[PDB]
Amino acid sequence: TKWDLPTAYPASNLHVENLTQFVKDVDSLSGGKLKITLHNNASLYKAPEIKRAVQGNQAQIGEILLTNFANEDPVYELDGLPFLATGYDASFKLYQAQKPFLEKKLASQGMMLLYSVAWPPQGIFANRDIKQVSDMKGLKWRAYSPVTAKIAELVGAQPVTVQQAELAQAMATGVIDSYMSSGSTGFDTKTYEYIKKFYDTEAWLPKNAVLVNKKAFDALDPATQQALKKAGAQAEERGWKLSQEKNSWYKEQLAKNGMAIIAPTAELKSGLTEVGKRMLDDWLKKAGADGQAMIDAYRKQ
């Protein structure tokens, strides 16, 4: 059996490095009965397209950024809310709280959640001095999701969505001067050529998820199914591992390259916390009882 797996990120990206090992694990564990071809850097499907591609079984498996789908259902927005889970442990616990509801929602559309891994803690790339939220008014902001567009609007920035595959170009032509993302993305797009500061706000840790079409899964023999699930579990473990481990490497490498890595003032964090509380209120209202259940489970961990 041959499957195709689109990802929106380049070969050098930590999630794709992990996906590369994952496809090798599926081959090895399934004894070669399942071969997955990776289509990287949005070459086959682009970020906004991948969930629909797997839903229709155009690709049997695919990697998405959960928060790209925040407008479709509140469950997708959760790991993009600022100042709710601001480290790897809190992020993993938020994930565990979210997971049953993510799986339920995906199941309603004929998909399975294979594994999910957090991007590194999100900071602000800017050329400006930002000591408080007001210092962000009027920023030419690059969003990578609906939620990150909302955050921009809430700080008075002016966002435009640009996928990572188009980010280097958007910076090089000056359409955007600032954004929130990881040291990972900053490094991989050589953001240091155009933008000189990264405020290490660790505001959230958004996850990617590898989704599988249920019908495609069901067509496989039991051993091959189990090989895929085991490869999936190994991928989750390794992905969280590599995400956290490389985070310090990217920050120090960005510094090597002339970027100022700056811890946020208490004032900047408090202002963004206020934005976060507003967004969580809004989210609870959209999400209803399921939102409350998720937040309760997260707060119990």
Applying CB under 6 A, which residues contact ligand PCA? 65, 119, 144, 164, 181-182, 184-185, 206
In 3-state terms, what secondary structure has residue 149? helix
Cα–Cα distance between 210 and 201 in angstroms, integer? 27
Q: What is the dihedral of CA 222, 223, 224, 229, to 10 degrees?
A: 90
CB of 212 to ligand PCA, least distance (A): 21
Specify the DSSP element, H or E, that contains 220.
none
| CB nearer ligand PCA, residue 101 or residue 187 | 187
Residue nearest to ligand PCA (CB): 182
| CB nearer ligand PCA, residue 30 or residue 181 | 181
Cα–Cα distance between 63 and 9 in angstroms, integer? 9
| CB nearer ligand PCA, residue 181 or residue 224 | 181
| CB nearer ligand PCA, residue 18 or residue 185 | 185
CB of 257 to ligand PCA, least distance (A): 18
- Rounded (5°) CA angle 62-297-229: 30
The arrangement of strands across the sheet holding 207-213 comes to: 61-65, 207-213, 111-118
Cα–Cα distance between 49 and 15 in angstroms, integer? 18
CB of 142 to ligand PCA, least distance (A): 8
CB of 181 to ligand PCA, least distance (A): 3
| CB nearer ligand PCA, residue 74 or residue 120 | 120
* Tokens describing residue 159: 């966002």
CB of 237 to ligand PCA, least distance (A): 20
Largest CA distance in the chain: 57
